[PDB]
Design a protein around this ligand. Structure first.
Ligand SMILES: Cc1cc(S(N)(O)O)ccc1NC(=O)COc1ccc(Cl)cc1C(=O)c1cc(F)cc(C(F)(F)F)c1
Lengths: 532, 401
């Protein structure tokens, strides 16, 4: 049965016209099946036999009894654009705990909604013959596979659930694709009655809902999750055992392993990723190293763990704690009651050209914060492994606007600290190294050195170098040769950057070397002066 | 209704909605449900692909739609009282409700399409579009132009002294009367309008002030010289020759260096050259106004408004508001609103900002503190060390104010 709902006015993109694609020829066996299938739809009021006046046409196909398959790629290419059919998918940690939740599959509902009569002509398709004129039809409802069907269907479903919603504010209905998830804290008999009120209501509008054979029941498979009444879990993850792995198998594997590091703690893929070096083909067989066998081995044990979370309780705190797993790597868990996580995560090692741990920390906070506002419409209380004084010292004197929402300190090592702090003023009684680096940027042959006020000096000849690198090496040497307290003078523009940012990690091996040196000193003061 | 059009070849805005907090979403739903009732907005379908972001600000919640994109794509329309910047005092008035009465071309409405997001993507957004002139839209003040003169003519004429300028939803009222008498003339206008705290002159431009040292050290000269060198891009007459000569050798960074008489003079000529803004800088309508902000720290911010590099139209300093201490993002938005407001007052257009903040950071929290009916354009940048050091040298009140 078709729905007595008004149509949405559709149009073809700017200027272009309906498709005129040629009908791929078929076997009597197939044409036969299509004729039958279509007769049914014509009967059901889904398609309409039309004449030759229609210059448009889309190719029809037969798959496996048989099933019709119309190819609208062309039409979709000429069909106007619609609203972003809700691109954001719901996360289990954001579903509110409910006494009862029911799933209502409103699938074949693409064929349940009317098509803008003005647009139906473009949907014309043709059933072959054994040759002679084939049988011609056009759709009277949203064609499965057509560009606007998803959006129009969802728009339609929304109008329909409008009254019911106003009449049952206790009840909550989620809309996702061809499905309705209806939940409430009503007594199970009451819930059931309202569900039936709804089926009947959707029915009223031409939307057949499941029968006892299609009805789904808990737990529910949701994008790799198993939703139970009082908790969710993740569908078991499978690691294919083999005695022969190709490049493709390994990447595939890394992919799944990477996804699991989010939920599971302890997943590693370094030795496995190592296997991808210099690969020549996807089918190429790569032998697993010992470390790789071990890795893959321990991971299997980790995935055999019962990792579960709980649902949202809008009346309790929303807490988010963070840890620094390693340099650039961060882990987090968002919970309300201790140990009962709503969700957990991990943030891949960002390889920024130059940054510091306190920065990366605030960046993690922000991602989590954005993520939270999306999932819960609120932003968490943060428990960060950084002292308030450490935060106070860095932020107030950092060239960039930065911030962290309400947070508290949690002493769960390793803590995030400042690896060093350039002196505010020159150091008294500290050697002063006047460093300098120059190089023929063309021949890439340069020299790096210094001259301290105490009479100490040095110069190094470097080949295959860049001016930036000589200047940087200049500084490295100074730090290297200086004592635990040094004053360094450079006309390097990049160093000017270090003075402002005071990075503790970067892309340059040189800078990294310098940072180690910087960290090691007890007092370092960097001064910049114009070149020449 | 007057038929409004997009600029030639310009298609409608299809900007995505940023996620909102539940609190803010509930608010907009209430606000919009009412507007719907009053036929100010109407729900739309999927056939409308356009979209403009929306959010809530500030006590109750106010709706604010980010039409920046639609404004750019909206056709142009057919004066700035340069006397506004001179008045001793000006008050800003929110005349946005004015537009709700005027209907909007039906053919243009689809472009005003906005969306109220839903927590955790559990349900689709609630799409609406406007029937009447919206707040924050370029065309609204434009269309309602004739009607705003009519209601203003009397008041203006009656007080041919007071100057009134209109920008977007705001009305800027400039006068010279004393406080009370001012607020009085304002309420007089209000009332007049209810039936249908800036000080421009006080904004003196501040000069750079080179440090005054009892005795200078090698470092003091190195820093002083770096700043001057750089600053030579603004004042070509600045010299650091004699200073750089005192900098010969390999002395301890802390060693005191006695200044020769040339260095003395050089610095003296330099101080004079800095006594006044550079000659030859004038505003150009054909060009964009640019606002650059540098975080100086300790709650201090320095900014510069200009259209051509090194040719500032204005420069300044902003100190965080009370109770804005732990929030960098808050201080900056408050700074933007203040700089943007002065810009409007002075030039009648908003400037584009160069914000020393990371895109993500700003976009996540700036609306929590925004309070203007308008929104300027912005880009995020990486402050050059020297530019910061330079404007940190700006002069300040003997005691205060
Ligand atoms: C899973 C369950 C079963 C029962 S029971 N006792 O079996 O009826 C009661 C509550 C729950 N669940 C909850 O408390 C919290 O979950 C929910 C709370 C409210 C609503 Cl309306 C649905 C759910 C879901 O479990 C659910 C299941 C899915 F497959 C997909 C989605 C969606 F697409 F919307 F994201 C939601």
């Amino acid at each position: 049965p078709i729905s007595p709902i008004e149509t949405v006015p559709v149009k073809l993109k700017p200027g272009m016209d309906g498709p005129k694609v040629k009908q791929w020829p078929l076997t009597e066996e197939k044409i036969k099946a299509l004729v039958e299938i279509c007769t049914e739809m014509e009967k059901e009021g889904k398609i309409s036999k039309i004449g030759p006046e229609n210059p448009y046409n889309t190719p029809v196909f037969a798959i496996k009894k048989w099933r019709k398959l119309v190819d609208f790629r062309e039409l979709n290419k000429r069909t106007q654009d619609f609203w972003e059919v809700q691109l954001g998918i719901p996360h289990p940690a954001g579903l509110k705990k409910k006494k009862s939740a029911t799933v209502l599959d409103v699938g074949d509902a693409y064929f349940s909604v009317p098509l803008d009569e003005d647009f139906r002509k473009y949907t014309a398709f043709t059933i072959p013959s054994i040759e002679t004129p084939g049988i011609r039809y056009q759709y009277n409802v949203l064609p499965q596979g057509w560009k606007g069907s998803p959006a129009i269907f969802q728009s339609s479903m929304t109008k329909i659930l409008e009254p019911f919603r106003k009449q049952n504010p206790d009840i909550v209905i989620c809309q996702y694709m061809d499905d309705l998830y209806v939940g409430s804290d009503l007594e199970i008999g009451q819930h059931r009655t309202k569900i039936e009120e709804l089926r009947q209501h959707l029915l009223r509008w031409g939307l057949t809902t499941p029968d006892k054979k299609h009805q789904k029941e808990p737990p529910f498979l949701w994008m790799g999750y198993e939703l139970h009444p009082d908790k969710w879990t993740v569908q078991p993850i499978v690691l294919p055992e083999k005695d022969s792995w190709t490049v493709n198998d390994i990447q595939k594997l890394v992919g799944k392993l990477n996804w699991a590091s989010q939920i599971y703690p302890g997943i590693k893929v370094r030795q496995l990723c190592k296997l991808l070096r210099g690969t020549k083909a996807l089918t190429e067989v790569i032998p697993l190293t010992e470390e790789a066998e071990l890795e893959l081995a321990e991971n299997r044990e980790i995935l055999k763990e019962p990792v579960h979370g709980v649902y949202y309780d809008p009346s309790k705190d929303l807490i988010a704690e963070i840890q620094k797993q390693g340099q650039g790597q961060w882990t987090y868990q968002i919970y309300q009651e201790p140990f009962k996580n709503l969700k957990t995560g991990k943030y891949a090692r960002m390889r920024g050209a130059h940054t510091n741990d306190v920065k990366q920390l605030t960046e993690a906070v922000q991602k989590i914060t954005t993520e939270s506002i999306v999932i819960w419409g609120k932003t968490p209380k943060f428990k960060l492994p950084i002292q308030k004084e450490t935060w106070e010292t860095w932020w107030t004197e950092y060239w960039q606007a930065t911030w962290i929402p309400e947070w508290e300190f949690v002493n769960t090592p390793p803590l995030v600290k400042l690896w060093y702090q350039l002196e505010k003023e020159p150091i008294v009684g500290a050697e002063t190294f006047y460093v300098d680096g120059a190089a023929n940027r063309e021949t890439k042959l340069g020299k790096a050195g210094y001259v301290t006020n105490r009479g100490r000096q040095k110069v190094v000849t470097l080949t295959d170098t860049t001016n930036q690198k000589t200047e940087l090496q200049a500084i490295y040497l100074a730090l290297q040769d200086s004592g635990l307290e040094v004053n360094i003078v450079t006309d390097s523009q990049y160093a000017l950057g270090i003075i402002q940012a005071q990075p503790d990690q970067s892309e340059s091996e040189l800078v990294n070397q310098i940072i180690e040196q910087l960290i090691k000193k007890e007092k370092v003061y960097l001064a910049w002066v114009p070149a020449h | 209704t007057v038929p409004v059009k997009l600029k030639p070849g310009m298609d409608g805005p299809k900007v995505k909605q940023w996620p909102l907090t539940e609190e803010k979403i509930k608010a907009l739903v209430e606000i919009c449900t009412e507007m719907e009732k009053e036929g100010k907005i109407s729900k739309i379908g999927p056939e409308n692909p356009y979209n403009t972001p929306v959010f809530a600000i500030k006590t109750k919640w106010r709706k604010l739609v980010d039409f920046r994109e639609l404004n750019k794509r909206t056709q142009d329309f057919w004066p700035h009282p340069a006397g506004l910047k001179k008045k001793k005092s000006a008050t800003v008035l929110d005349v946005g409700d004015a537009y709700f009465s005027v209907p909007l071309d039906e053919d243009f409405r689809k472009y005003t399409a906005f969306t109220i997001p839903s927590i955790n993507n559990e349900t689709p957004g609630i799409r609406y579009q406007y029937n009447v002139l919206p707040q924050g839209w370029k065309g609204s003040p434009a269309i309602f132009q004739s009607s705003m003169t009519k209601i203003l003519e009397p008041f203006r004429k009656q007080n041919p002294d007071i100057v009134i300028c209109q920008y977007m939803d705001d009305l800027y009222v400039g006068s010279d009367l004393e406080i009370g008498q001012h607020r009085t003339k304002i309420e007089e206008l209000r009332q007049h309008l209810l039936r249908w705290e800036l000080h421009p002159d006080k904004w003196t431009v501040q000069p750079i002030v080179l440090p005054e040292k009892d005795s200078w050290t090698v470092n003091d000269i190195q820093k002083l010289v770096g700043k001057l060198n750089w600053a030579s891009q603004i004042y070509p007459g600045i010299k650091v020759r004699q200073l750089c000569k005192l900098l010969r050798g390999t002395k301890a960074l802390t060693e005191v260096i006695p200044l020769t008489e040339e260095a003395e003079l050089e610095l003296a000529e330099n101080r004079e050259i800095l006594k006044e803004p550079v000659h030859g800088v004038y505003y150009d309508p054909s060009k964009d106004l640019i606002a650059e902000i540098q975080k100086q720290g300790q709650g201090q911010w320095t900014y510069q408004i200009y259209q051509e590099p090194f040719k500032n139209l204005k420069t300044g300093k902003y100190a965080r508001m009370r109770g804005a201490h732990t929030n960098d993002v808050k201080q900056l938005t408050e700074a933007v609103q203040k700089i943007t407001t002065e810009s409007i007052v002075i030039w009648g257009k908003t400037p584009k900002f160069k914000l020393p903040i990371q895109k993500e950071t700003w976009e996540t929290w700036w609306t929590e503190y925004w309070q203007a009916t308008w929104i300027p354009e912005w880009e995020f940048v990486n402050t050059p060390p020297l530019v910061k050091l330079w404007y940190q040298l700006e002069k300040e009140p003997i005691v205060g104010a």
